Symmetry: C3
Subunit: 340 residues, 3 copies
């Protein structure tokens, strides 16, 4: 929502309130998504300034406030900055920005990230190139220098983030993505490799001096249909946890498959079906083990551009004897969303 537009600078304030509850069998400790209150809220701004006829500068900030916490010590659990960056965009040259932003491999994994609540399981945060990561300098080019419409690409430099935990750390890396869009279809591929930190190497699970993440994707977004498919492969990058021996690390190799189909009815109801399967391989002590494996059946009711209800059902196919202890129960999310 544009709240300022004077003297060649415009600022949009964005926010949503999401009333959200998850339902699962017991405590939800052996379920896909958990059990209980998951209400959150989001606030941010997006400003673009016209420096000259060809040059424009921008900045985005986006923050998540959890409303499912109390007023005691747990008051901040889940609060985080999603995105926070600035950059410059010139004519038909491209754009450059640095900050906390989407990894370039999310240019591909975003195709199947359309479920009312869930989906996009492989797009972990603070995981190199698949999700929101800190310290990324990203060059992007749309319409290939204004010569070929629909043909976009991007190159990204990931800065080293040596943090307290191996889960949220990374070393230097490079990545890129190419995409084409024609008459309703979009195809995309993205790749990224980076150095691992010593602390990551020192974990039980995962072994290798380099992490690697790539993925392809196809989508059809027209005539009220949304159909998409993603395939991705990772090396030493997907974060895993053994809930039995209570160790953590990274999967030496994962094969990721995400499918999704939605139809948008005129009167606002948007049903969806989806498949998601992530298989880890060469896991220390375990061997092969599935991380994610479900079918999804859901629907969102759009009242208008500002209000929506949704239900999302996960038919979890993960077996009860999963070697890594991955939860095997189903989970249902029921949501009510005000956004501007």
């Amino acid at each position: 929502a544009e709240i300022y537009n004077k003297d060649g600078n415009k600022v949009d304030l964005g926010g949503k309130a999401v009333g959200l509850h998850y339902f699962s069998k017991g405590n939800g400790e052996n379920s896909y998504g958990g059990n209980g209150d998951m209400t959150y809220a989001r606030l941010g701004f997006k400003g673009e300034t016209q420096i000259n006829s060809d040059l424009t500068g921008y900045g985005h900030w986006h923050y998540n406030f959890q409303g499912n916490n109390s007023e005691g010590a747990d008051a901040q659990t889940g609060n985080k900055t999603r995105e926070a960056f600035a950059g410059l965009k010139y004519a038909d040259v491209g754009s450059f920005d640095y900050g906390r932003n989407h990894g370039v491999v999310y240019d591909a994994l975003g195709y199947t990230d359309m479920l009312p609540e869930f989906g996009g399981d492989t797009a972990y945060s603070d995981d190199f190139f698949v999700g929101h990561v800190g310290g990324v300098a990203t060059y992007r080019n749309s319409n290939f220098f204004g010569l070929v419409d629909g043909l976009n690409f991007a190159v990204q430099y990931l800065g080293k983030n040596e943090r307290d935990t191996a889960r949220r750390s990374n070393g230097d890396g490079v990545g890129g993505s190419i995409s084409y869009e024609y008459e309703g279809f979009g195809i995309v591929g993205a790749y990224g490799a980076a150095d691992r930190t010593n602390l990551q190497e020192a974990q039980p699970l995962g072994n290798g001096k380099k992490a690697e993440q790539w993925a392809t994707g196809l989508k059809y977004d027209a005539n009220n249909i949304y159909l998409a498919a993603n395939y991705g492969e990772t090396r030493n990058a997907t974060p895993i946890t053994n809930k039995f021996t209570n160790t953590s690390g990274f999967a030496n190799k994962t094969q990721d498959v995400l499918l999704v189909a939605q139809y948008q009815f005129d009167f606002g109801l948007r049903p969806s079906i989806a498949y998601t399967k992530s298989k880890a391989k060469d896991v220390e002590g375990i061997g092969d083990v599935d991380l994610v494996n479900y079918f999804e059946v859901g629907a969102t009711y759009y009242f208008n551009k500002n209000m929506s209800t949704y239900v999302d059902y996960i038919i979890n196919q993960i077996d009860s004897d999963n070697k890594l202890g991955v939860g095997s129960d189903d989970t249902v999310a029921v949501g009510i969303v005000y956004q501007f």
Copy 2:
């Protein structure tokens, strides 16, 4: 303050800066409110969208930022989401919303919550139905389906919130409230019962498989007078602490009494007097013990709809030999408030 109003969605941004200092005898450790800097700030939004002529959707978010902290490790102490919810309101049918919101029993305890700084002692947060609680689905009906003016009611389902601490947890519950308003008067009553969590049961103080909170109230809000009275009773719900044996839990039974009288002078000065007395009973090892017992004398000076000063004096009647260790000293709050 309305900052957006285009295409049937309006958004209000709200905020206040509250310069605030408390004065007490020693460290304030044996006082009502404490001693030192209590400056805070608040920010939120409130959006309502017109879906059709009869249906409207809304969302509220409200956040508290403490300014009395430092820039070190204590930087977030007191920061919290007060409210965060969305819902739908239809014609003369009623409204429904889910999220972190006021407990339905606060429909009654809000009558005496009008002191410049203090008062409303029984409306604890994260305490079932008396204050701000997370995961509440609330149906509300004003003017009894548009048939009887002044006659409002509400029913509320409290979701289970199993947290790390027994103080901030709760199980499933139901509650409701009815109110009538006529020629300046308002009468109200509210009730709520809920299951306790196992962790709550396992505490030294309090015993029972169910928590219970109810209260009645009368107010007179006209001719520049504000007069209100509240009476409430709780079972296994009021959080208590024994500062001697350093244990905590819940009071098996409390009797709550809150009175308040204010007059609003034309030139902005609004003096107030108030009484508050909360007596816990059947406390393990202690027996009977008062939790709150004071007289209040204060005044607010309203410069206008955006600026105010206030002083609030608590004449604390709690005895120095209180069995639970409740603080017995007086406390004075001096405040300066900018709000929009």
Copy 3:
């Protein structure tokens, strides 16, 4: 950016997104500023309401969100309230405000706080009077009661803030500052003394029942030139740390010198040079030791009032055998800033 202006209340929303990276030799553990991602974002409001023709009320809130954190446990590290206060301003009488605000001695140290990223090293936060401190009641008078133009002064009462750590605590204090501005020049002096807390006294480093901070300054801000110089002296106030014996406390005495020179080119480039030297004396076990000692060479490119790039180089003169373990390596900051 003014987002509301109805009925004699105006509200400005402010924010910036700062993409920022520091470069240093190894881990940055022996460097001036460190090494890695330093992206942050800021949001706040500033409201002023016209109560009558002579009286106006105001309020400021300003918050810092770190974007260089992850989404795990370190998600809030660095998040803080910078400022949060309200007050009243009357005609030619002056202004009064209370809250978390700038110490009065910053009226002087702000002269040399103009580097693209660094500088202003002596203006520590939560350090009595030199930086952002909590619980300050400040009277300010501009143009000496409207009689002498350019002649401003301020008196400040610092409230006691007894916190968990000795670094961020303080006792009661008073301070003041006087400044004159004439044909492009500004001269200033400020003084402040305060009681130390018992916890501060109990530290290894620093000894004395009272803290003391004063400083003078000259600036020339015209004809596209910025030239400034600061000299300050502290007693028992400057926070120090011995990274060898891993102790902390306060310096019994510091001599502070800050110089800065900048030129603003028409086409947006603003190069800068600066010197900064802070010498601690009478340090327990150490004797004399330098805390800060560098030359700075940097430049900011201003695209316009909303967008800028900058590079800041610190030529660190601190010797590798510094007795307190102060880092001796150079550091380079590269920044891109969107602000409104």
